Amino acid sequence: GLSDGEWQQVLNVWGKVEADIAGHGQEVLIRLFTGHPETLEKFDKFKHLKTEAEMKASEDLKKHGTVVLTALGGILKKKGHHEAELKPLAQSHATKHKIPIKYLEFISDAIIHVLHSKHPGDFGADAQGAMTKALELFRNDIAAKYKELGFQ
């Protein structure tokens, strides 16, 4: 649960992502895959990528980065009222993609990392705190649906 002050910070930070959604999306996925190579194995269409150069040169990775961040952004803009938006994602990720919640933790931290990297000195403590809380909320609501499904 975030205050309106914190949501305002979240959506302000998100304005940065939206000025270049593909670049941000790409770098988030690269940070995930290089930081936690086991995550790469969940994507049959990215598992072929072995090097970060190949990742960087992949237009399809950028495209998926756009899909992922577009979805997260739509969820963030709901300011916590995202049951309708989140439920199909939780279901697809638990039942089809089989993504354990740990990996959602991974990508959460990766987003924080990328924002600092692309906006050094421009991602303040208050903004990081708000964004972190937002991603925790997201994760926690997914986790609840995972439990429902008995998914580990």
Tokens 């910070």: give the residue: 9
Give the type of residue at 59. E
Residue 47 is a binding residue for ligand HEM (CB under 6 A) = no
Other Cβ atoms within 10 Å of 6 Cβ, number: 19
Binding residues: 64, 93
In the list 16, 42, 77, 118, the residue contacting ligand HEM (rule: CB under 6 A) is: 42
Residue 101 is a binding residue for ligand HEM (CB under 6 A) = no
Closest CB to ligand HEM: residue number: 92
Binding residues for O2: 64
Count residues binding ligand HEM (CB under 6 A): 16
Residue 90 is a binding residue for ligand HEM (CB under 6 A) = no
Residue 147 is a binding residue for ligand HEM (CB under 6 A) = no
Q: Which stretch binds ligand HEM (CB under 6 A): 76-84, 102-110, 115-123, 144-152?
A: 102-110
Q: CA 56, CA 98: separation in Å to the nearest integer?
A: 25
C-beta separation of 31 from 53 below 8 A: no
Residue 97 is a binding residue for ligand HEM (CB under 6 A) = yes
In the list 10, 72, 114, 115, the residue contacting ligand HEM (rule: CB under 6 A) is: 72
Residue 89 is a binding residue for ligand HEM (CB under 6 A) = yes
- Contacts by 12-19 with C-beta closer than 8 Å and gap 24+? 12/127, 13/115, 13/123, 13/127, 13/130, 13/131, 14/73, 14/76, 14/77, 16/115, 16/118, 16/119, 16/122, 17/69, 17/73, 17/115, 18/73
Return residues touching ligand HEM (CB under 6 A): 39, 42-43, 45, 67-68, 71-72, 89, 92-93, 97, 99, 103-104, 107
